Design an enzyme around this catalytic site. Structure first.
Site: not given
Ligand SMILES: [Ca+2]
Length: 257
Positions: A94, A130, A132, A134-135, A140, A144
């Site tokens: 998907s 910053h 990331s 976003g997980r 994750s 920074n």
């Molecule tokens: Ca962590």
């Protein structure tokens, strides 16, 4: 105008508040990587069904929060850079998004006129960064940085060095510096309307790093044909500790200059 000068461009007042400013390059290209990091992304139910070909795009904007905050050619700004890896072709899964890196910034940039024997230090920016995906762990990844972006030009040449200093937590990727390094060199060359570019990072102590070559040419006055060849570690946060060679082709709005 002064092509490539991020700061000088932000100093330029925009008629319409919705007319944003470009920070980094903006592009959307269809890629195909040498190897797909299925191990770090194993937690995904589509991991084992992941394809090496995916649409890679980069959205990068700048918002001058306050001009003249520290002099006529200065500006406090914020930028947003987002790199995304999308399995558009993977219809069986998907078309999921494999990775998205949200990299907002806050900085004090200055448009300068320093002479360096032919070269001209046009941009001197310093701020917080910053980055990331976003997980939620295990996938994750985030870090920074307190950096300094220096940009100088010499005719058809453009050189930008972005040294940085990691601040805050990094437990999602403690050894992120072992692959990313302490700076980001960037070289752009203008061959007429064609723009050749190079952007990389390298840890001289660990031998790790990655780099990306790019070639662009205007399709029109606003859009451009862009070919990218990334190779190494750190393409994306999730793959920061993963080596891979990704070649892609697509469209681009603005190049480094
Ligand atoms: Ca962590």
């Amino acid at each position: 105008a002064v092509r490539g000068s991020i700061i000088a461009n932000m100093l330029q007042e925009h008629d319409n508040p919705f007319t944003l400013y470009p920070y980094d390059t903006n592009y959307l290209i269809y890629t195909q990587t040498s190897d797909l990091n299925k191990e770090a992304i194993a937690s995904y139910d589509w991991a084992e069904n992941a394809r090496k070909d995916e649409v890679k795009f980069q959205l990068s904007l700048a918002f001058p929060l306050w001009r003249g905050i520290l002099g006529p050619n200065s500006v406090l700004g914020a930028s947003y850079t987002q790199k995304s890896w999308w399995q558009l072709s993977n219809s069986e899964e998907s078309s999921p998004f494999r990775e998205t890196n949200y990299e907002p910034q806050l900085f004090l940039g200055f448009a300068t006129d320093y002479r360096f024997a032919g070269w001209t230090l046009r941009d001197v920016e310093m701020g917080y960064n910053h980055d990331s995906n976003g997980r939620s762990d295990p996938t994750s990844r985030s870090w920074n940085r307190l950096y300094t972006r220096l940009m100088a030009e010499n005719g058809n040449w453009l050189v930008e060095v972005k040294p940085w200093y990691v601040v805050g937590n990094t437990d999602d990727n403690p050894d992120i510096t072992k692959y990313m390094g302490y700076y980001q060199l960037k070289i752009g060359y203008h061959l007429g309307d064609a723009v050749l570019s190079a952007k990389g990072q390298y840890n001289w102590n660990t031998g790790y790093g990655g780099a990306e070559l790019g070639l662009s040419y205007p399709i029109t006055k606003h859009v451009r044909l862009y070919t990218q060849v990334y190779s190494g570690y750190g393409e994306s946060l999730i793959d920061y500790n993963f080596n891979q060679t990704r070649v892609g082709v697509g469209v681009m709005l603005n190049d480094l200059f």
